[model samples]
Target chain A: MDVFMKGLSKAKEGVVAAAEKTKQGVAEAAGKTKEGVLYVGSKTKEGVVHGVATVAEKTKEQVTNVGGAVVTGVTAVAQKTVEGAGSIAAATGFVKKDQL
Target chain B: MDVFMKGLSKAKEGVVAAAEKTKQGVAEAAGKTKEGVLYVGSKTKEGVVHGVATVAEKTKEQVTNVGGAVVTGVTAVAQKTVEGAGSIAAATGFVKKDQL
Candidate 1:
């Protein structure tokens, strides 16, 4: 009977020790999971900011080039018209010149 | 000593029960965290798709209008040149007419 009593004592000690181990494992997993969430959030924000900046810079460059070309085209047309008027004067007897 | 053994037996049961409860709590928290991560991923994807779609549509509209305007300006310039030439012919004796 005393031997059985000793076994119960040993079993009690084993249960408590195992419980402690399980609790530590839970804490460790929880900590790592929290870190994973935080890391993902930080990286996502950085990626979005970088992506938007690149898109904006590229967009500005393209728009500026498009505007410049349009202006250049209009100016060329004006130059041609003036020369054309001169030629009309000379031909009909205005002065002398024309992009598509 | 016998009472001590009985106490140990009861303590073992209590420790095992508490460990079970702690494991369940940890599992629940982990499950929720996983759900949260998934929700964030879904929403971010959806928002990005919507935003990009909107930007693309607007850009297409603006670019098409700009191209149309440039073509119209060029056509108008051509019409004026033709009319000017005719007028010069009529005036200095070609045909007379003009827009800028």
Candidate 2:
């Protein structure tokens, strides 16, 4: 019975450690995700602004091509923001549950 | 014996709840991840702009790519996270320890 109790206590310690580590991992990943999302969003906005400026300098055809590329870039960034945000939210759910 | 049986029954219920919920959370997260990564990585931009715009688009593209990469990476990370979290959060660890 004493051995059993000792093992049980050890198991509990392991459980606590594992939970803490899991929570830490989620926090780290979420932080990275938030940074990635913000960085991309800022860049996308800048791309759009530049695409607008170049419209006056280039030929109509060149401008259109560049514009399309810029738009695609913006779209990519938007998609990334959405993905990262969603992931962060989901991971947070687990973290919250673990804390509880 | 009656008290032991009652405790055992309660333990079983708690373990099942932890295991099921952990599995569900992981499944939901995984599904969302697949969709998010694919959507973001597909849209890349190619064009010239003022240095600012150029930098923005480049930053945006890098994020999109990297973000998507993280998602794929997170699939594995999340699995491990779930296992770790579940073990900690699980009320079932010692449930069978004495029985066997």
Candidate 3:
């Protein structure tokens, strides 16, 4: 009986430790996903700004192509960034009203 | 002997469950970090462009300060974005050659 109780205690300890570790791991993962999406988004925004600034120096067609790409990139990045943020928020148990 | 084996089996189950939970937690944390960094970065970029666009309507000093802030904000965002990306990439096991 003593041995069975010891085993049960060990199992409880294991579960608690596991749960804590799991929470930390999830938090870390969510953070990384957010970062990846954000990096791409920010770079896209910078590219758009730079492209627009130089539009006057380039040929009209060239400017249009670059400008269009910049807009597309920024849009894509923004969408991705938002998605990443939502995922992270969810993982962290940041229960917003909408989340419920 | 059978009871001992049963205890061992339960212990194994506990350990596996814990390991899986930990992995998910870490991944989620990493993702969130990435998203937060990116959102701030992209917003900063947009702010700079808008600021520069309105520079013509403002005093030269106003324009200068706006421009300066934009530059500073972009630099800071860029640095953080990169760090975020690195963390996400690491979490996902997308190991670069340099990671070795």
Candidate 4:
């Protein structure tokens, strides 16, 4: 979370800046809704499969042999993705500042 | 999570089966660790970018109009990823059931 707090603050500048420059029209907004579904849908599938890999690596009897690296990686993904989604949600008033 | 609870049971079965069969032998496990790193790295990048899209879509004028669907999808990923990671961590003894 410490890493995410620092990095997200910086990257969100570009994220909002870039997105602000590209505000949506009616057609684009509707189109984006569909794309969002596919994008998020595929990542959800990917996340599940990736999690499987880590679980398998740890299933060995030695117990000490674990996939710490994979654990770190997935946590990184979850942290960034959730924050980015929040920034967008807050910006759009879907959620408010106090909410954030 | 309802969907995940169902799919994960079957998927974890295959995940453990596959990983057990391909056990490290100190050879294949090393290769997979490297592969896992790359795979996780790219996915992390993809996840950040994906979140950007959702935030962008929501940064519009209509307060009631938000990316509710995108919100749903990312939540799905987070829930499943965390659980799957938990399973692996528990199996490997990095985390305990009480901790989870």
Candidate 5:
């Protein structure tokens, strides 16, 4: 089937494809290297989302708990920004789950 | 301080922060060490971004699937650039990712 599998999907292929392309030169140079980069990208992607998520979550909590326009604004903006990046990644083929 | 850039900046900053954490995370860190740096260079945010982008552009032909020319080369480079380089950049205290 052509279903997008997290472990195996467009992202996975993109990973290897990008890595392989990177392999042409400039130290791209390795099988292990490609896998390594793929893993790093995967983890980092999660990390970036989580970090912002934390800030947004906290800001959200604070705003809800107390009430401030500034923090409230950050909460809203940050959340949307992350979503924006997600959108870009989605279109760009950064692929993933939940959904890629 | 302005409002518009502020949100974008924070979003970008959030992205960088996430990048740093993930590299150290139980991600591809070992693989990075195992494979080691492909191209010797500073792991700084700009440094890594510039270096990796440069290579990808030079060898742009290698990776075919990166997005459109405007964003593809730089982004794919940024994405794949992180493999081993991602860890290094994080170690130096900065992360690189953009719409492009």
Candidate 6:
């Protein structure tokens, strides 16, 4: 009877240990799963923020380029208009090249 | 005197049978445990992948769905452990089936 009880006790102990180990594994699995999800969220946010920043910078640069072109065109047109007026004044003698 | 020896043999037979049953019960419990752990791992990986996919599609709707099945599966694993231990007890005559 003692031998039988010893065997029974050992059997129970094994079962108890198995349950604990299995429980621990379940917790570990859950932890790993949560971490994986959080990691993905973090990396995805970082990627999108970086992408948006790059796009914004490129857009600003293009807008500046177009503004520069417009300014140059306007300045050239104004200079030509002033030159035409000066030539008419000289030709008509309303204003002399050296005197009124 | 003959009856005494005959009873001893029968008692020995009962004890040996109980030990064998206890061993088999322990082995079955271990198998169940291993299977539970592996099942949890697989389900966890699947859950994270699905959660990540949902998050990627819409962004910020996270924690929206975290595999209802995983929770259910974990509960089932816990239940199986209880059953496994109870089976060992029953086989070893420490616990009655009706009590279980």
Query: Candidate 4, residues A1-100: lDDT per residue as tens digits?
Result: 0100000011111112111122211111010111011112211111211221111222223111112112211222322222222122111101112211
DockQ of 5: 0.02
Candidate 2 chain A: 10-residue stretch with minimal lDDT:
A2-11
Candidate 4: C-alpha lDDT: 0.17
Q: Write the per-residue lDDT of candidate 6 for residues A23-97, one digit (tens) a residue.
A: 201101110111011101101110111111111321212211111001111111101112121121111101112
Candidate 2, which segments miss by more than 4 Å at Cα? A1-43, A47-63, A68-92, A95-100, B1-37, B40-100
Candidate 4 stretches greater than 4 Å from native: A1-31, A35-100, B1-100
Displacement of the residue A52 alpha carbon in candidate 4, Å: 21
Q: Which lDDT tens digits does candidate 6 get at residues B3-95?
A: 000011111111221111122222111101111122122111111221122113323222222221222112211111221211221111121
Score candidate 3 by DockQ: 0.10
Error of 2 at B18 (Å): 43
- Poorly placed runs, candidate 1 (over 4 Å): A1-72, A77-100, B1-100
B49-81: candidate 5 lDDT, tens digit per residue? 111121221221332211111111121121222
Which regions of candidate 5 deviate over 4 angstroms? A1-100, B1-38, B46-100
**What would the per-residue lDDT of candidate 5 be over residues A1-100, giving only the tens digit for each residue?**
1322111111211112111111111111111222122211111111111111112211212111111100111111101112122121101112112312
TM-score of each: 0.14, 0.17, 0.16, 0.11, 0.13, 0.15
Candidate 3 has a TM-score of: 0.16
lDDT digits (tens) for residues A15-62 of candidate 2: 221111121011111211222221221112112224232223322222
lDDT of 3 by residue, B1-100 (tens): 0111111122333444322223322122122234334433222222233313221222222211222122122322322232132222322322112211
List CA RMSD, all candidates: 38.7, 19.0, 20.6, 28.7, 27.3, 40.5
Q: Compared to the true structure, candidate 6 yields what TM-score?
A: 0.15
Angstrom error at residue A98, model 5: 33
